[PDB]
Amino acid sequence: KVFGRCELAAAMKRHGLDNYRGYSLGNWVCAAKFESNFNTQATNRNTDGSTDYGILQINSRWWCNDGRTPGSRNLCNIPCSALLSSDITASVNCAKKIVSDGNGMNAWVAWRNRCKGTDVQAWIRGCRL
Ligand SMILES: [Cl-]
Ligand SMILES: [Cl-]
Ligand SMILES: [Cl-]
Ligand SMILES: [Cl-]
Ligand SMILES: [Cl-]
Ligand SMILES: [Cl-]
Ligand SMILES: [Cl-]
Ligand code: NA
Ligand SMILES: [Xe]
Ligand SMILES: [Xe]
Known part of the structure; x- marks a missing residue:
């Protein structure tokens, strides 16, 4: 399944990822x-x-x-x-489990290189949620 951005945001939220370990x-x-x-x-x-x-x-x-x-x-x-x-x-x-492991979201190299430090809220901007 290829999620839409807002659809994935919703799913992630539902599954308790929003602000999980502060992210x-x-x-x-x-x-x-x-x-x-x-x-x-x-x-x-x-x-x-x-x-x-x-x-x-x-x-x-x-x-x-x-x-x-x-x-x-x-x-x-x-x-x-x-x-x-x-x-x-x-x-x-x-x-x-991964993000609790000590290096937080730096476990995800793309996050570290492409997301970390950026206006990540843009990714959920306009989404209903
Ligand atoms: Cl997108
Ligand atoms: Cl196996
Ligand atoms: Cl194991
Ligand atoms: Cl194996
Ligand atoms: Cl962290
Ligand atoms: Cl990973
Ligand atoms: Cl955000
Ligand atoms: Na394995
Ligand atoms: Xe693969
Ligand atoms: Xe996910």
């Missing part, structure tokens, strides 16, 4: 925009052989199990496929 909803929407272009099915292979999954591009090195990332953990206790669902619950739940 306003625009941060999450922005991160999702640049991580996946709001596409729940987004996948990207990393050079280390791990893969990033879903609307927030959660990595199999730590967070999910894909059966093909040797020595990996599965800290969200989920198959990485769960992260590709049109329903964002698993992505959100895993994102919450």
Whole structure:
């Protein structure tokens, strides 16, 4: 599923991401925009052989199990496929673990490079919510 911006904002809000660990909803929407272009099915292979999954591009090195990332953990206790669902619950739940992990949203390289420090509220501007 490719979310619309406002539709994703709504979904993220519903799932308790707005201001989760202090990160306003625009941060999450922005991160999702640049991580996946709001596409729940987004996948990207990393050079280390791990893969990033879903609307927030959660990595199999730590967070999910894909059966093909040797020595990996599965800290969200989920198959990485769960992260590709049109329903964002698993992505959100895993994102919450990630962002609690100590480096906050810097875990998401696109957030750090494209969202951090920017007018992230623009991403939820005009949305009803
Ligand atoms: Cl957009
Ligand atoms: Cl915001
Ligand atoms: Cl991540
Ligand atoms: Cl497996
Ligand atoms: Cl694995
Ligand atoms: Cl684990
Ligand atoms: Cl933080
Ligand atoms: Na893993
Ligand atoms: Xe991929
Ligand atoms: Xe998400």
